[PDB]
Ligand binder design. Structure first.
Ligand code: W5M
Length: 167
């Protein structure tokens, strides 16, 4: 049993809800929250800006030190950093950004990072400002992630479309 509440069950391991990721993380304090990161860990908008704003910019300060030491992530890659006031850990995952011309086949590689964690709170990778089709992102998630993933969808309209169209 876990603390996650109000989710629709899509598969054995994937659950979905209409939820602002900041508010859900604040309520649950999950072991892992996933950030929709870029390779520079520049958390300017979307999930990254929302999460970082909720940490009072502590996520960005930590991220800048990580990049100064390690250099940029790979598209499809990840790193584990603090969850600050939101979670124990934040898994920063870089999905391909279609608005930068990145290979959508890298979305599967991005989701494979989730399999290193038994339970996660996450957004759909490469959707929204990253430019991918969220229906596609949900299909790759279900077909790639084997650990237990609780997906938060921000827009009530998109949530309803993802559920209605789910095979
Ligand atoms: C895609 N996107 C942008 N902002 C958010 C947010 N606050 N919450 C969730 N679940 N998704 C988001």
């Amino acid at each position: 049993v876990n603390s996650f509440s109000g989710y629709l069950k899509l598969t054995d391991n994937v659950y979905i809800k209409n939820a602002d990721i900041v508010e859900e993380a604040k309520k649950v304090k999950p072991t892992v929250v996933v950030n929709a990161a870029n390779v520079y860990l520049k958390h300017g908008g979307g999930v990254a800006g929302a999460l970082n704003k909720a940490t009072n910019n502590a996520m960005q300060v930590e991220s800048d030190d990580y990049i100064a030491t390690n250099g940029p992530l790979k598209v499809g890659g990840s790193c584990v950093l603090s969850g600050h006031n939101l979670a124990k850990h934040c898994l920063h995952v870089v999905g391909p950004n279609v608005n930068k011309g990145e290979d959508i086949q890298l979305l599967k590689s991005a989701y494979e990072n989730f399999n290193q964690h038994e339970v996660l709170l996450a957004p759909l990778l490469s959707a929204g400002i990253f430019g991918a089709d969220p229906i596609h992102s949900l299909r790759v998630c279900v077909d790639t992630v084997r650990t237990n993933v609780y997906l938060a969808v921000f827009d009530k309209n998109l949530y309803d479309k993802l559920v209605s169209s789910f095979l």
